[PDB]
Every structure is written in structure tokens, then in C-alpha cells.
Write an enzyme that holds these catalytic residues in place. Structure first.
Site, short mmCIF file in Angstrom:
data_model
loop_
_atom_site.label_atom_id
_atom_site.label_comp_id
_atom_site.label_asym_id
_atom_site.label_seq_id
_atom_site.Cartn_x
_atom_site.Cartn_y
_atom_site.Cartn_z
N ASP A 25 0.70 -1.29 0.25
CA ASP A 25 -0.60 0.17 0.51
C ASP A 25 1.26 0.94 -0.35
OD1 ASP A 25 -1.87 1.66 0.14
OD2 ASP A 25 -2.73 1.10 1.64
N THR A 26 1.19 2.15 -1.49
CA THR A 26 1.70 3.41 -1.53
C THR A 26 0.91 4.20 -0.77
OG1 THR A 26 0.96 3.09 -3.41
CG2 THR A 26 3.01 2.51 -3.41
N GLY A 27 0.00 3.88 -0.82
CA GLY A 27 -1.33 5.36 0.17
C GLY A 27 -0.90 5.34 1.59
C1 017 Z 1 -6.59 6.97 3.03
C2 017 Z 1 -5.74 6.73 2.96
C3 017 Z 1 -4.85 7.33 1.28
C4 017 Z 1 -5.01 5.93 3.81
N1 017 Z 1 -4.83 4.23 3.99
C5 017 Z 1 -4.37 4.04 3.09
C6 017 Z 1 -5.01 2.83 1.88
O1 017 Z 1 -4.26 2.54 0.38
C7 017 Z 1 -6.36 1.93 2.13
C8 017 Z 1 -6.48 0.87 2.82
C9 017 Z 1 -7.33 -0.12 2.80
C10 017 Z 1 -7.31 -1.12 2.06
C11 017 Z 1 -8.81 -1.55 2.06
C12 017 Z 1 -9.35 -1.23 3.78
C13 017 Z 1 -9.30 -0.50 3.90
C14 017 Z 1 -8.40 0.14 4.29
N2 017 Z 1 -7.39 2.04 1.42
C15 017 Z 1 -8.84 2.86 0.99
O2 017 Z 1 -8.63 3.16 2.19
O3 017 Z 1 -9.45 1.74 -0.04
C16 017 Z 1 -10.85 2.48 0.25
C17 017 Z 1 -10.79 4.43 -0.52
O4 017 Z 1 -10.43 4.05 -1.83
C18 017 Z 1 -10.64 2.53 -2.10
O5 017 Z 1 -10.25 1.57 -2.80
C19 017 Z 1 -10.91 -0.30 -1.61
C20 017 Z 1 -11.26 0.51 -0.74
C21 017 Z 1 -11.45 2.47 -0.25
S1 017 Z 1 -4.57 3.95 5.55
O6 017 Z 1 -5.19 2.01 5.08
O7 017 Z 1 -6.00 4.59 6.19
C22 017 Z 1 -3.22 4.29 6.58
C23 017 Z 1 -3.27 4.81 6.93
C24 017 Z 1 -2.21 5.65 7.98
C25 017 Z 1 -0.80 4.29 7.96
N3 017 Z 1 0.34 3.98 8.77
C26 017 Z 1 -1.23 3.05 7.51
C27 017 Z 1 -2.35 2.38 6.83
#
Ligand code: 017
Lengths: 99, 99
Positions: free
Chosen positions: B25-27
């Protein structure tokens, strides 16, 4: 370009005539943008993340220019803490992870 | 390896003697894992994402083997819906985005 990950991989994009920055998020299945003035019809949608779920409006066939690369795909608009380019659009520019 | 993004970039990793799958997860700034009773001390931490915030336990200098690549860094433990390898560990295996 090749992008390392020492800083957030945030790129410049053009969408709906507006200039915006968005995070290249391989963990995001789909693209989501903070509230913004898009044209056309839309459908309410509920997505999920770490902290729970948010309600967003889904727009299909939206033209985005991601760092000078044009793509057309679904774009969700809602209360995300940051604009996120998801895998639905990353695949179209040929983005890959490498290590 | 080079990973395309038509599917979730999920890899097999070894952590605390246990085998798990996690999302590249690059995000994600930092690594977050579903509940697991890792050994040792920890400090409470609250992180935020789409849908709100979650409370997690922070462990520092934890050994992970990501696709047969060893790294040592901070690993958060809490109610995430999926294991996520964040940028804190992706940089150590030299992970880059390319397009
Ligand atoms: C707001 C994001 C940029 C930040 N996130 C990483 C992100 O990749 C998450 C990681 C993620 C993956 C699956 C479930 C929850 C979180 N993906 C996500 O939120 O996806 C949702 C928004 O776009 C859609 O894509 C699929 C789900 C929807 S995060 O999970 O909340 C996160 C935040 C801080 C840290 N240290 C680690 C992870």
C-alpha cells in the site's frame, strides 16, 4: 517516471477543468476525491476504509489527466481525507510496483 | 518482482513466526496488521483513514520478511480490515512506482 516512496507519491492531476493533487494509492481499489464541482448525474455509494465507511457519489467515464497521462474511469467524490488515485485508474497508465 | 495492479498487490510475508498476507500500500505511511499477539512492549496510537480513526498498538523495530525480503520497522496492530504494508517498510525493500 520511477517514483520512490520516501515521501508520499503525490502527483498533479487535471480533473473537471480543475487542478488537483492526488495520492497514488495501490491500496485503493477505486479513485476517490474530496468534495468538488463535477458535472453530470451520479449515484450514492458507500465505501469502506480503516476507520469505517463513508458515503460518496460515483461518477463514471470521468476524464483525468494524471501527471500528463489521460485516463477515463470511475471517480468517487466524498469526504476522503485526501484525494486518492485507486487501482481502477492506475492500471490505465501502466503503473507497476517494482522491487 | 514487478507487480501490475489489475489485482490487489497482496504478498505473502512472515512476521512473529506467523505467515500472513498483506497489501503493498503506497497510500499507507506505516504498516498496520490485524490483531496478532506480537511479543514485547508497545505504546497506544490512534491512526486515521477513510471512514475515521482506529486505536492501535505500536511496536517498533519488528522484523518482517516481505516476499522473502527482510526489513525492520514499526508495525501497528489494530482493527484494520486488511493487513497493509506501508511506506515505512516499502522503502527498505526499495519499492518504487513506475509508469
Ligand atoms: C486514506 C488512505 C490514502 C490511507 N490508507 C491506505 C489506503 O491504501 C487504504 C488501505 C485500505 C485497504 C482496504 C481496506 C481499508 C484500507 N485504502 C482505502 O482506503 O481504500 C478505500 C478508498 O479508496 C477505495 O479503494 C478500496 C477501498 C476504498 S489507510 O489504510 O487508512 C492507512 C493510514 C495510515 C497508515 N500508517 C497506514 C494505512
Amino acid at each position: 517516471p520511477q517514483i520512490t516512496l520516501w515521501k508520499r507519491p503525490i502527483v498533479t492531476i487535471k480533473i473537471g477543468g480543475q487542478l488537483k493533487e492526488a495520492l497514488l494509492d495501490t491500496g485503493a481499489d477505486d479513485t476517490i476525491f474530496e468534495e468538488m464541482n463535477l458535472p453530470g448525474r451520479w449515484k450514492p455509494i458507500i465505501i469502506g476504509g480503516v476507520g469505517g465507511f463513508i458515503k460518496v457519489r460515483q461518477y463514471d467515464q470521468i476524464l483525468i489527466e494524471i501527471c500528463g497521462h489521460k485516463v477515463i474511469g470511475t471517480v468517487l467524490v466524498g469526504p476522503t481525507p485526501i484525494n486518492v488515485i485507486g487501482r481502477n485508474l492506475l492500471t490505465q497508465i501502466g503503473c507497476t510496483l517494482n522491487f
